[PDB]
Amino acid sequence: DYWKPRHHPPRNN
Amino acid sequence: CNWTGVKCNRRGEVSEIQLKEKQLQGSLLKSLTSLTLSSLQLTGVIPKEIGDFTELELLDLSDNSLSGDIPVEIFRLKKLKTLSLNTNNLEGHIPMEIGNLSGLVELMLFDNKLSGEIPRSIGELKNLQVLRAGGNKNLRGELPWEIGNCENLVMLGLAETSLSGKLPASIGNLKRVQTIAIYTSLLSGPIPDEIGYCTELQNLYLYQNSISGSIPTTIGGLKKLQSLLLWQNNLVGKIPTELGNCPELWLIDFSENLLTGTIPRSFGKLENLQELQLSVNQISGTIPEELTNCTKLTHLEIDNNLITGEIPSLMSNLRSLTMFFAWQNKLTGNIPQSLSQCRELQAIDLSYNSLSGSIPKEIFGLRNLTKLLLLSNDLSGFIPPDIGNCTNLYRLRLNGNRLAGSIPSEIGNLKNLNFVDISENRLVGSIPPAISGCESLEFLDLHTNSLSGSLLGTTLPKSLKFIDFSDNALSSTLPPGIGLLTELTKLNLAKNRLSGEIPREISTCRSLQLLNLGENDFSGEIPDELGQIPSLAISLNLSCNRFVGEIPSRFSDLKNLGVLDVSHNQLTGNLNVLTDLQNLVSLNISYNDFSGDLPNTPFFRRLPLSDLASNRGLYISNAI
Ligand SMILES: *[C@@H]1O[C@H](CO)[C@@H](OC2O[C@H](CO)[C@@H](O)[C@H](O)[C@H]2NC(C)=O)[C@H](O)[C@H]1NC(C)=O
Ligand SMILES: *[C@@H]1O[C@H](CO)[C@@H](O)[C@H](O)[C@H]1NC(C)=O
Ligand SMILES: *[C@@H]1O[C@H](CO)[C@@H](O)[C@H](O)[C@H]1NC(C)=O
C-alpha cells in the first residue's frame, strides 16, 4: 500500500 | 427481488449487485447497471465476459486478490462512469482501449502490480475527474502529453510509480485540477512553467524525485494553492518571491534541494502558513522579520543552510510555534529571551551555529519543551537555576560551548529528563547530589570539563544506562555504591584524578558492557570481581594507572570481551589466563612488568614487538 502524502521528516540532534 | 445486496430497476429487472466486507475465497441478468464485489478476498482473473454487461455504469472490484491482466473487453462498456480496480494483484499494461470509455469519471487503478506506460488514449476521456494509478512500481514512461485533454480532472495521482521524464507543458491545460500527486517516483527535468495555468491547483506533491531546474515563478499566480511539497529533488535557484501571493498556503516543504538565495520577505503576507520546511539547502541571508508576521506558524525548520545574522526577537509574535529548527547555520548573537513568549514550544534545536551570550533563563520557563539542543555554539555563562522550571524537558544537549560555573542543583527537579549532554564546557565544582532526583535519567555525559571533588553512589540516579565523566579533575575513590546502578551499560571515568582500589561492588553492575578507567591514579590489585561481569563486551580499559600484581585468573571468564587495554601499569606475571579468549580482538599489554612466553598463534603473533619490548620478559615461543 503506497504511503499517503507527508512532509520531510524533521531531524534534530 | 430483494434479499440484501440486490437492487432492481422499476421495470422489474435486476439493476444493482453489491457485496462487501465478507470473507471468502476463489474466482468470481443483462440489465445490471452497477456491480460491486469488493473486499471479498477473491482470487483469480477478471473474466472477459464482464465486458458483456452493456449497461454497466459502476464496476468496483477493489480490495481483492485478483490477478492477470485488465481484460480489454472491460473497455467495451461504453456506459461506465466508475471503474474501481484498486488494491489487487493486477498486472500488465493499461490497454489503449481505455480511451473508449467515453463517459468514465472515476478511474482507480492504484495499489496494483501494473506495468507499462500510460496510454496516450487517456486524453480521450473528456469527463475524467479522478485518475489515481499510484502504488504500481513498474508503471513507467513519461506522463503522456494527451493528459492535457482531460478537461475535467480534479485529482491526479501517480505516486510511487516509475514515471519518469519532465511533466508535460500540457499540464497547464488542466484548469480544474486540484491535487497533483506524483511523489516517490522517477521524474526529472524542470517543473514546467505552464503549471501556473492550473488555476484551481491546491496541492502540489512532487517530492522524492530527481526534478531539476528552479521553482517556476508562475507558481505564485496560483491563488488557491494550499500545500506545496517539493522535498528531496535537485531544485536549484531562489525561492520565488511570488509565493507570498498565495493567501491560502499553509504548508511549504522545499527540504533537501539545492536552493540558494534568501528567504523572501513576502512570506510575511501568508496569514495561513502553519509549516515552513527549508531544511538541507543552500539558503543564505538572515531570517527576515516579516516571517514573524505569520501568526499561525507551528513548524519552522530552516536547518542545514547558510543563514547568517541574529534570531529576530519578534519571534515572540509566533504564539503557535511548536517546533523551531535552525541548526547547522551561520547564526550569531544571543538567543533572544522573547523566544520564551512562544509558550507552546516543544522542540528547539539551534545547534551548530555561532550563537553567543548566556542561555536566557526564560527559555527554561517553557512548560511544554521536551527537546532543547544548543550544542556546538559559542555560548557561555552559567546554566540558570531556572532550569528546574522546565517541567517536561526530555532531551537536553548543551555540549560544545563555553558554559561556566557549577551544575545547578535544581536540575534534580526534572523528572522526565532522559538524556543530558553537557560535555565540552568549562563547568566547575562537584556533580550536585540533587541530580539523584532525576528518576528518568538514562544518559549522562559530563566529559571534558573542570568537574571536581569526589564521586558518590547516592549522587546518581539508579536508572542510569550511560555515564561519561571522562576528562575532568574528579578525585578520591570510586564509591562502592557504584554497584547500585544495575542498568549501567557504559561507564567512562577516564582521565581523572581518581584513586584507591577498584571496589569489588563493581561486580554487581550486571549490565556493564563498557568500562573505561584509563588515565587515573588507581592502585593495588585488579580485583577478581572484574572478571565476574559476563556482560563486559565492548571494552575494558584499565590503562595508565598504578595497578600491580597479576591479571586475575577470573579474567578467563570474560568470554565476550572484544577490546582490552591494561597498558602503562605495574602488572606482572604472564598472560596465560588470556590465551583462550576467542572473541578478543584488540589487546594492549605494553609498558608493564609482564614476563613469560606467549604461544605462536595468529592472535599473539599480531601483537606488535615493541609492545613486548616495553615489558620485562615477554616473548613468542614455539611449542615442542
Ligand atoms: C522559575 O521558577 C521560579 C520560582 O517561582 C521563578 O521565580 C521568581 O519570579 C517571581 C516573579 O515571577 C518573583 O516574584 C519571585 O521572587 C521569584 N522566586 C524566586 C524564589 O526566585 C522564576 O522566575 C522561574 N523562572 C523562569 C524563567 O520562569
Ligand atoms: C585506554 O585509555 C587511554 C588513556 O585514556 C587511551 O589513551 C587509550 O586510547 C584507551 N584505549 C583504547 C583501546 O581505546
Ligand atoms: C593500546 O592499544 C590499542 C590498540 O592498538 C590502542 O587503540 C590504544 O591507544 C593503546 N593504549 C594506549 C594507552 O595507547
Side-chain angles (χ1 to χ4, degrees), chain A, chain B residues 3 5-20 24-40 42-624:
Chain A
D1 271 48
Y2 81 102
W3 291 356
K4 299 162 170 50
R6 64 191 172 95
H7 69 168
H8 171 265
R11 152 187 166 210
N12 56 267
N13 284 274
Chain B
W3 291 254
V6 193
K7 317 233 282 175
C8 291
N9 57 13
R10 53 189 59 56
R11 306 206 164 193
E13 317 141 359
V14 169
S15 207
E16 306 181 3
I17 293 171
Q18 165 148 339
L19 299 135
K20 4 174 306 306
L24 273 79
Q25 226 76 48
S27 311
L28 19 65
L29 43 135
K30 271 60 225 173
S31 62
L32 180 74
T33 227
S34 173
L35 179 55
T36 317
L37 316 165
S38 184
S39 314
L40 300 183
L42 298 178
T43 49
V45 202
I46 295 174
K48 277 64 182 159
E49 300 89 59
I50 277 289
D52 296 346
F53 304 124
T54 60
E55 259 51 55
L56 226 46
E57 278 166 35
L58 189 144
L59 179 67
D60 172 31
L61 295 171
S62 73
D63 200 20
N64 287 303
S65 268
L66 311 162
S67 318
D69 289 9
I70 304 171
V72 77
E73 290 67 14
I74 250 178
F75 302 109
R76 296 175 169 175
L77 311 178
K78 183 93 183 316
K79 274 158 187 166
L80 218 65
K81 297 174 68 216
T82 293
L83 174 62
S84 310
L85 300 177
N86 62 283
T87 333
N88 283 306
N89 287 297
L90 299 156
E91 39 167 344
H93 292 236
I94 292 156
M96 186 76 165
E97 294 73 21
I98 183 93
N100 276 326
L101 301 180
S102 199
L104 193 57
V105 176
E106 318 289 335
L107 170 67
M108 315 283 180
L109 311 174
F110 68 88
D111 286 330
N112 276 316
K113 285 165 139 187
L114 305 178
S115 42
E117 226 303 299
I118 297 167
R120 340 236 322 202
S121 252
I122 29 72
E124 280 168 29
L125 305 180
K126 291 268 140 35
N127 304 120
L128 193 58
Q129 285 177 36
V130 172
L131 150 58
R132 310 175 54 201
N136 295 283
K137 196 175 60 173
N138 295 308
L139 211 291
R140 296 178 67 183
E142 279 195 331
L143 180 67
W145 183 263
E146 288 77 6
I147 201 61
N149 289 318
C150 299
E151 49 169 0
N152 292 351
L153 267 172
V154 311
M155 174 47 207
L156 175 71
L158 300 159
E160 283 184 38
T161 60
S162 296
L163 227 81
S164 63
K166 63 175 104 297
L167 299 176
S170 262
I171 222 64
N173 272 123
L174 294 183
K175 246 82 186 178
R176 311 173 123 176
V177 88
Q178 286 181 28
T179 298
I180 295 179
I182 322 184
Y183 56 81
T184 321
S185 280
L186 300 184
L187 299 174
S188 31
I191 293 144
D193 289 85
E194 293 75 15
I195 213 187
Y197 283 128
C198 301
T199 85
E200 300 293 288
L201 195 61
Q202 297 193 0
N203 315 293
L204 181 54
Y205 313 148
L206 304 174
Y207 65 94
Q208 290 187 316
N209 293 283
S210 298
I211 294 174
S212 70
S214 44
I215 297 149
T217 295
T218 57
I219 283 219
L222 300 186
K223 305 311 178 199
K224 314 292 192 58
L225 191 61
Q226 313 191 3
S227 59
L228 195 58
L229 297 172
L230 299 192
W231 66 277
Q232 192 170 300
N233 276 291
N234 302 314
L235 299 163
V236 125
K238 44 197 56 164
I239 302 167
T241 266
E242 286 70 23
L243 282 175
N245 309 334
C246 299
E248 301 190 357
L249 193 47
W250 72 273
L251 170 45
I252 300 180
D253 196 338
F254 301 160
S255 322
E256 312 256 15
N257 282 281
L258 309 172
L259 310 181
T260 58
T262 243
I263 302 174
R265 299 178 290 106
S266 56
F267 273 21
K269 312 165 190 295
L270 302 168
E271 300 205 313
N272 300 297
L273 189 61
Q274 297 176 31
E275 183 158 346
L276 177 55
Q277 303 210 310
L278 303 179
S279 301
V280 195
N281 282 293
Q282 293 143 53
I283 291 147
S284 57
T286 65
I287 319 176
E289 293 215 275
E290 6 254 314
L291 235 209
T292 68
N293 263 13
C294 308
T295 50
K296 291 169 146 200
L297 220 41
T298 68
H299 287 79
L300 180 57
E301 282 81 72
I302 64 173
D303 59 286
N304 283 276
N305 284 288
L306 307 175
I307 309 171
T308 46
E310 296 200 27
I311 304 160
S313 49
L314 283 181
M315 212 107 178
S316 33
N317 274 293
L318 314 161
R319 292 294 169 82
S320 290
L321 198 65
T322 66
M323 191 175 304
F324 180 33
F325 290 0
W327 61 280
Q328 192 55 83
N329 276 292
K330 268 71 185 160
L331 301 176
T332 52
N334 296 74
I335 298 164
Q337 60 97 28
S338 52
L339 194 56
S340 67
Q341 291 173 49
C342 309
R343 301 308 302 164
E344 13 47 313
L345 274 172
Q346 298 166 9
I348 301 166
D349 192 342
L350 305 177
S351 306
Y352 296 106
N353 284 283
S354 283
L355 302 166
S356 32
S358 286
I359 311 175
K361 303 201 150 186
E362 299 89 335
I363 239 69
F364 288 108
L366 301 165
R367 287 175 45 253
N368 266 136
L369 193 61
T370 65
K371 297 178 179 170
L372 180 49
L373 313 164
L374 304 185
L375 68 87
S376 174
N377 279 283
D378 203 32
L379 302 167
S380 56
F382 296 141
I383 297 170
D386 312 65
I387 192 193
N389 297 25
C390 207
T391 309
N392 285 326
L393 202 50
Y394 188 83
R395 174 174 190 83
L396 181 65
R397 306 200 63 184
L398 303 186
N399 57 280
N401 288 285
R402 281 191 294 122
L403 301 172
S406 293
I407 301 171
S409 171
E410 36 278 289
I411 194 173
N413 205 36
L414 308 184
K415 313 289 159 172
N416 311 109
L417 188 50
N418 184 252
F419 183 105
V420 54
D421 190 356
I422 319 156
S423 54
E424 294 190 301
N425 283 279
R426 321 283 218 269
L427 306 184
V428 291
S430 296
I431 293 157
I435 198 187
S436 67
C438 309
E439 52 184 311
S440 296
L441 182 66
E442 304 186 311
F443 178 107
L444 178 55
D445 199 342
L446 306 187
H447 81 256
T448 304
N449 285 285
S450 295
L451 292 186
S452 180
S454 167
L455 192 76
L456 293 358
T458 42
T459 311
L460 294 178
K462 302 192 190 186
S463 59
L464 274 166
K465 284 201 203 292
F466 183 99
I467 293 181
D468 195 347
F469 300 162
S470 60
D471 199 14
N472 283 289
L474 296 183
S475 78
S476 188
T477 52
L478 178 59
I482 198 272
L484 298 181
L485 326 164
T486 65
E487 307 289 78
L488 199 49
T489 174
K490 300 194 182 176
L491 172 57
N492 184 351
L493 301 172
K495 204 178 192 316
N496 279 292
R497 296 279 85 232
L498 293 162
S499 66
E501 252 88 314
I502 294 168
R504 316 191 172 280
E505 342 271 359
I506 189 86
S507 54
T508 57
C509 301
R510 189 72 45 157
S511 300
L512 206 50
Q513 294 168 22
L514 182 147
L515 175 65
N516 197 349
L517 302 185
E519 270 183 273
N520 276 285
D521 205 35
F522 294 111
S523 68
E525 287 185 300
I526 311 178
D528 228 25
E529 284 77 15
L530 292 172
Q532 280 169 335
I533 311 179
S535 48
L536 269 180
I538 302 181
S539 172
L540 171 63
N541 192 336
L542 298 178
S543 77
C544 314
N545 279 300
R546 292 179 298 113
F547 296 117
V548 295
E550 296 181 345
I551 290 177
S553 67
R554 195 79 57 145
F555 262 37
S556 55
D557 278 331
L558 300 161
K559 233 65 206 163
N560 282 304
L561 187 50
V563 175
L564 171 71
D565 193 341
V566 293
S567 75
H568 291 96
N569 279 289
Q570 288 152 256
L571 276 40
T572 52
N574 67 69
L575 303 178
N576 294 341
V577 52
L578 275 22
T579 48
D580 94 342
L581 300 179
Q582 64 278 9
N583 301 96
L584 192 59
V585 174
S586 181
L587 176 55
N588 193 340
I589 49 66
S590 76
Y591 301 89
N592 271 290
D593 293 312
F594 294 127
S595 86
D597 68 315
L598 319 164
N600 200 344
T601 75
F603 187 96
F604 296 109
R605 196 73 132 88
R606 122 175 59 49
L607 294 181
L609 183 44
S610 41
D611 274 24
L612 314 186
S614 56
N615 281 277
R616 183 186 294 170
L618 282 182
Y619 67 102
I620 273 83
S621 84
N622 293 286
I624 304 165

CSV table of all heavy atoms in Angstrom, one decimal, chain B residues 494-495 516 518-519 541 543-544 563 565, ligand 2:
chain,number,residue,atom,x,y,z
B,494,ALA,N,37.4,8.0,32.6
B,494,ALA,CA,38.8,8.1,32.1
B,494,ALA,C,39.4,9.5,32.2
B,494,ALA,O,38.6,10.5,32.1
B,494,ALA,CB,39.0,7.5,30.7
B,495,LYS,N,40.7,9.6,32.4
B,495,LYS,CA,41.3,10.9,32.5
B,495,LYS,C,40.8,11.8,33.7
B,495,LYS,O,40.3,12.9,33.5
B,495,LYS,CB,41.3,11.7,31.2
B,495,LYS,CG,42.4,12.7,31.1
B,495,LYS,CD,42.4,13.5,29.8
B,495,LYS,CE,43.7,14.3,29.6
B,495,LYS,NZ,44.1,15.0,30.8
B,516,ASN,N,35.6,2.1,31.2
B,516,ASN,CA,36.9,2.9,31.0
B,516,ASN,C,37.3,3.6,32.2
B,516,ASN,O,36.7,4.5,32.7
B,516,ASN,CB,36.7,3.9,29.9
B,516,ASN,CG,38.1,4.4,29.4
B,516,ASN,OD1,39.1,4.1,30.0
B,516,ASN,ND2,38.1,5.1,28.3
B,518,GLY,N,40.8,4.3,32.4
B,518,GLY,CA,42.0,4.8,31.9
B,518,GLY,C,42.5,6.2,32.4
B,518,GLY,O,41.6,7.0,32.7
B,519,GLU,N,43.8,6.4,32.6
B,519,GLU,CA,44.3,7.7,33.0
B,519,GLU,C,43.8,8.2,34.3
B,519,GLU,O,43.1,9.2,34.4
B,519,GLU,CB,44.1,8.7,31.9
B,519,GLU,CG,45.2,8.8,30.9
B,519,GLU,CD,44.9,9.9,29.9
B,519,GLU,OE1,44.2,9.7,28.9
B,519,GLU,OE2,45.4,11.0,30.2
B,541,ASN,N,39.2,-0.9,29.7
B,541,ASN,CA,40.4,-0.1,29.7
B,541,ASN,C,40.8,0.2,31.1
B,541,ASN,O,40.1,1.0,31.8
B,541,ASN,CB,40.1,1.2,28.9
B,541,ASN,CG,41.4,1.9,28.5
B,541,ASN,OD1,42.4,1.8,29.2
B,541,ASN,ND2,41.3,2.8,27.5
B,543,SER,N,44.1,1.1,31.6
B,543,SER,CA,45.5,1.6,31.3
B,543,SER,C,45.8,2.9,32.0
B,543,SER,O,44.9,3.6,32.6
B,543,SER,CB,45.6,1.9,29.8
B,543,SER,OG,44.9,3.1,29.4
B,544,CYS,N,47.1,3.3,32.0
B,544,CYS,CA,47.6,4.5,32.6
B,544,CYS,C,47.2,4.7,34.0
B,544,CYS,O,46.8,5.8,34.4
B,544,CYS,CB,47.3,5.7,31.7
B,544,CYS,SG,47.7,5.3,29.9
B,563,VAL,N,37.8,-5.8,23.4
B,563,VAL,CA,38.9,-5.0,23.5
B,563,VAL,C,39.4,-4.9,24.9
B,563,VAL,O,38.6,-4.6,25.9
B,563,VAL,CB,38.6,-3.5,23.0
B,563,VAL,CG1,39.8,-2.6,23.2
B,563,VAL,CG2,38.2,-3.6,21.5
B,565,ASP,N,42.7,-3.2,27.3
B,565,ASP,CA,43.8,-2.3,27.4
B,565,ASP,C,44.2,-2.2,28.9
B,565,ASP,O,43.5,-1.5,29.7
B,565,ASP,CB,43.5,-1.0,26.8
B,565,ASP,CG,44.8,-0.1,26.6
B,565,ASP,OD1,45.8,-0.4,27.2
B,565,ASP,OD2,44.7,0.8,25.8
C,2,LIG,C1,42.5,3.5,27.1
C,2,LIG,O1,42.8,4.7,27.8
C,2,LIG,C2,43.8,5.5,27.4
C,2,LIG,C3,44.0,6.6,28.4
C,2,LIG,O2,42.9,7.5,28.4
C,2,LIG,C4,43.6,6.0,26.0
C,2,LIG,O3,44.5,7.0,25.5
C,2,LIG,C5,43.5,4.7,25.1
C,2,LIG,O4,43.3,5.0,23.7
C,2,LIG,C6,42.4,3.8,25.6
C,2,LIG,N1,42.4,2.5,24.9
C,2,LIG,C7,41.6,2.2,23.9
C,2,LIG,C8,41.8,0.8,23.4
C,2,LIG,O5,40.8,2.9,23.3
